[PDB]
Amino acid sequence: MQGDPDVLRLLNEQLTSELTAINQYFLHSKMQDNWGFTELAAHTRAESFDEMRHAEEITDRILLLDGLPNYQRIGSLRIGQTLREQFEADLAIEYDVLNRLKPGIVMCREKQDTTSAVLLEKIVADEEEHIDYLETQLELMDKLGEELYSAQCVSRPPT
Amino acid sequence: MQGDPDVLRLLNEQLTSELTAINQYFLHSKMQDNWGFTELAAHTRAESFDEMRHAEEITDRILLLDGLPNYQRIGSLRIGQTLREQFEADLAIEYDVLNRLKPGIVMCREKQDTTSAVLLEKIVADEEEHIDYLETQLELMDKLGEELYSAQCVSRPPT
Amino acid sequence: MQGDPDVLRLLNEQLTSELTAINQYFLHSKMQDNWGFTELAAHTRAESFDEMRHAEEITDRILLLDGLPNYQRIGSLRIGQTLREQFEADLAIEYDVLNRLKPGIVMCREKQDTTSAVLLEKIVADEEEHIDYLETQLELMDKLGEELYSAQCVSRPPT
Amino acid sequence: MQGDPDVLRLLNEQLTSELTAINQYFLHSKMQDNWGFTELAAHTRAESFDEMRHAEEITDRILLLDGLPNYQRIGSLRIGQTLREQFEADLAIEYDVLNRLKPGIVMCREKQDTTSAVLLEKIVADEEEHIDYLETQLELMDKLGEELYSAQCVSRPPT
Amino acid sequence: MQGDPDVLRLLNEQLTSELTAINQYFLHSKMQDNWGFTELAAHTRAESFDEMRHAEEITDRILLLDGLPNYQRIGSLRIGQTLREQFEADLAIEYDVLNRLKPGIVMCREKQDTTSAVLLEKIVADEEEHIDYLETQLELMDKLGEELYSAQCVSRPPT
Amino acid sequence: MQGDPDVLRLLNEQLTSELTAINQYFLHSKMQDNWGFTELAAHTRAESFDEMRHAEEITDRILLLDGLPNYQRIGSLRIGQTLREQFEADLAIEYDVLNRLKPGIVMCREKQDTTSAVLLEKIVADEEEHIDYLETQLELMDKLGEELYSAQCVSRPPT
Amino acid sequence: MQGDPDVLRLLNEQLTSELTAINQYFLHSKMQDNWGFTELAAHTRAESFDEMRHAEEITDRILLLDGLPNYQRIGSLRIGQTLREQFEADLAIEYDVLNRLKPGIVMCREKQDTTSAVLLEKIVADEEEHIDYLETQLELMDKLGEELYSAQCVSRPPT
Ligand code: HEM
Ligand code: HEM
Ligand code: HEM
Ligand code: HEM
Ligand SMILES: [Fe+3]
Ligand SMILES: [Fe+3]
Ligand SMILES: [Fe+3]
Ligand SMILES: [Fe+3]
Ligand SMILES: [Fe+3]
Ligand SMILES: [Fe+3]
Ligand SMILES: [Fe+3]
Ligand SMILES: [Fe+3]
Ligand SMILES: [Fe+3]
Ligand SMILES: [Fe+3]
Ligand SMILES: [Fe+3]
Ligand SMILES: [Fe+3]
Numbered sequence A, B, C, D, E, F, G: 001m002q003g004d005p006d007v008l009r010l011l012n013e014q015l016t017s018e019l020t021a022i023n024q025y026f027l028h029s030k031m032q033d034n035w036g037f038t039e040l041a042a043h044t045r046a047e048s049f050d051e052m053r054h055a056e057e058i059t060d061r062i063l064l065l066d067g068l069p070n071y072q073r074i075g076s077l078r079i080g081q082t083l084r085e086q087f088e089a090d091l092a093i094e095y096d097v098l099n100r101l102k103p104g105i106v107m108c109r110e111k112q113d114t115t116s117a118v119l120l121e122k123i124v125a126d127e128e129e130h131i132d133y134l135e136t137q138l139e140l141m142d143k144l145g146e147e148l149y150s151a152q153c154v155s156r157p158p159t
């Protein structure tokens, strides 16, 4: 069996939006960790692993279609240097992915690959939550005030 | 606190060698996973998770010093279509790590960042041990026969 | 067996940087306790005991080398009278120790005492963490604002 | 057996400093409860019961001496209408008791009643802790700022 | 709250006698630990941990009063090369504590800090009991013989 | 992957040593057991067994470094004929080991063989500890006396 | 009680192929584990220890006969460079041992050391068990083929 070249591209293009996100997210939590937002550190680490889940899932698909999953390339990481920054820098990829995955899902249905369509419908819903979350952190950051908010991300005492 | 910019240079350099290997190693496994080489893929898979472990390990040391860890660059991946070829390409990476890290270790103690020295030293031991293993696979392929050796990386029944 | 007189001095000099730190740290936590930063109190107590670990370890070494461990002298304690103060007053010793232990480690290797070198390499890494921590508390104190931060060190309700 | 009339008075006078404190403390916690400082509510309730312990203990003594414990009278309750107020209103009795119990303890030794002296030495130490605490809450209230501090006395969410 | 500056004088004075003994006692143990006198070193070791316990105990009382506890001074240590000599030197310290503390106890009640009196009283009881023990070692050395007595502080086989 | 032939020489040189201890010690222990010093025997036995530990771990590096583990060589055995004697025989070895190994360590280090160093850095520490032990016996042998000490190496009752 | 030097000559001499066995078998199993014949390796190794127990039962009785165990005389090792020799080698010592013991059991029963008789009988039974094994290994090697036998000696996957 072989997979359709325009899917293969859309997959291997999500594969990278994954590889890309894995690093930022990971590194972002490790930084959250070093500044001392350990509570929050842990959760950014959580989302990070979630993306390695997605990559491994996309990878699984490509090989089934008999394509060559691309681990070699990467996206351009926005790397926030404050909490706020980082959330933005993250929403950054998240939306992109959505922007990339909407028409690609229908592209799939046209191409008649129901399995890869559902792979991507799921990533969408997953990511939408990541988004609603990230952007909520913001909604809340202004309601509370960076400062105050930030102590909601440390242990007692910190680290 | 603030580390020595060359040492950091060396550390953020290893962190690349590392992500290279994670990606490379992972892909080979999922690759052997495909060909039905399931027992083996679990092993290869495990090696990747170590290289992940290493990566965060270097990442930690970086932030403690102060440096900005590079989760943005990736070395050039070598992927072998066959098992034997796959073995070569990973030796390929490790032997490089030994080269990078030997002189590197000596310099670290020299510049008096002993802790970052001990770190790399450990790495070396693992890295050697991964090599011993991989070269030993290459002989068992010879001694046993590429086919017969291959019959030993599938389960019962296969995949 | 006998130990080399320049090591013996470096050991017995770290022995005191230990005895010294044991008191400040201890007293510092007991004060953190009395003001009411009990969460934090507990952790300063933690680091304190860690140093009595180091002293007892240095002491173990000296006797092996057949030297006379010096419990009689002490260092000059910087005793902070606010949280912030204290962290500084602590980083105070921590760096010193590092400053004292870098060339002493190589001194050891020259002298060819691998065991006492490793004793001190470990203290270094330990202390570097204490440092990264202490100085992080600072990084965070300014990001959060003494006040806010400080309630991150009490129980609910306080004491 | 009969007890010495000047002790009896000192006992039955502490008996009331007890009955008095039981109400304020209790009522004070119940108010802390209704405003919503439940964490803190619970602890004021704690000290309250501690005083009913003391009353019952004083009472035990008087009957042994064959006196008539006086449950009929009461002291004048300072009833705080803010957290701060209350702490003051409490330290209010606490010091009094100390002020009353120092010379009374020696009065006892003169009178040669070692048992009732020790009853009161204990109350002293108990109360000194209550004091150091209360007054610490203050020390901390200014360091933190009423507001901030106060949320250190609620549950998540409040009540 | 604020204690009586002379009493505090007395307390911060005991806290010195204490750190002296901790350091002295600990070192003797690790000292008997070396000579192979292992069973005995555990005992001596334990005595040190009590003196630590005492120290924090005095430290606590200090802060409650208000005084600044002296973790900066240390008395003059006497270290015996032999077991018997080692015994003398620790009697040396305790008998001093009895001298310091007797008159001290009387003054405390006098000045009407009964609680700090009770404290020292306790200390005395322990301090006497440590003395009883140490003098009794000195006789068993006599009765039994310094060698034979020494055979009773090693395990089986020795260290 | 091959290892530096000088190192492999030093590695092999420790190997024949360790094999000499495995044999020296083991016999001693048994002799000790046949003497009635069963308590002592056990201990010595645990030292020969741990000797064997190093032998294997040295064999490990050797094989990995691709040289040839020497199991034909075997230094000269001096087999003690008094308890005291055996002690002195075995200190003999532990010093030759320390005498060959302290210099031999830096060679490894300089010749960029980090792991081989750490290997021996550890054998060293053990040797120092076993040396310490053995001289601590002999000091104890003199303080107690031969009859006295020996008796601590018998079970009660003997054998 | 003293021993018959005819036997004491035998016993001590059996100790020799004994100690020589230990060494040969041990190194082999390390070579085998090292080549990747880990399943095979485990068994070889077990024989190594199975041999140390023979050295011990020998070393016990030698001492029981007021004899004098020899731990200096290592017999001439044969060292296989492939599984086929290794078997052959091992099978060599095992046979030598058989031809030296056959008579021995007669010299013993004659000169009247029955106990040593039954010791050496037992050693023999084992020696045959390991010979019956070493030759089946040689057959299965012919019957199945070398590559093929070799593949039942790796785990799955190979080490
Ligand atoms: C780039 C491609 C990567 C892929 C496909 C990948 C995949 C995975 C998978 C499948 C897991 C197991 C899922 C789980 O345990 O929940 C995992 C865990 C983990 N990942 Fe990754 N990962 C990647 C990169 C990274 C990076 C860049 C880091 C760190 C910077 C990292 C660090 C870790 C660690 C430390 C674990 C758990 C360790 C363990 O349980 O053994 N990985 N990853
Ligand atoms: C100055 C040299 C000192 C040394 C070498 C030393 C050593 C030790 C050691 C080895 C331990 C056990 C480790 C553990 O339990 O985790 C310990 C525990 C402890 N230390 Fe110290 N210490 C010293 C001074 C002090 C001081 C100044 C204080 C208080 C002001 C103190 C208070 C304590 C207490 C209360 C414990 C635990 C009590 C127990 O478990 O019995 N020590 N110390
Ligand atoms: C005025 C003289 C009083 C005395 C001598 C007294 C004595 C005691 C004693 C001995 C206890 C048991 C100790 C324990 O459970 O820990 C207790 C518990 C308690 N007290 Fe009082 N008390 C007094 C007044 C009050 C007042 C004014 C209140 C409330 C406004 C109160 C409410 C309670 C409650 C609700 C309990 C626990 C309920 C239970 O476990 O049955 N008491 N008291
Ligand atoms: C040369 C005379 C030796 C004697 C008499 C001896 C004695 C023994 C015996 C009786 C056992 C356990 C037997 C069993 O469980 O079946 C043992 C365990 C062991 N043998 Fe030996 N042994 C000798 C030499 C060696 C050598 C040459 C090596 C490797 C080079 C070695 C490595 C070990 C190890 C590593 C263990 C237990 C694992 C550990 O504690 O690390 N031994 N020894
Ligand atoms: Fe994703
Ligand atoms: Fe996400
Ligand atoms: Fe690596
Ligand atoms: Fe690796
Ligand atoms: Fe330290
Ligand atoms: Fe520290
Ligand atoms: Fe009361
Ligand atoms: Fe109270
Ligand atoms: Fe004391
Ligand atoms: Fe004491
Ligand atoms: Fe050794
Ligand atoms: Fe040793």
Ligand SMILES: [Fe+3]
Pocket: G047, G050, G051, G126, G127, G130
């Ligand atoms: Fe055998």
Ligand SMILES: [Fe+3]
Pocket: G018, G021, G051, G054, G097, G123, G127
């Ligand atoms: Fe045998």
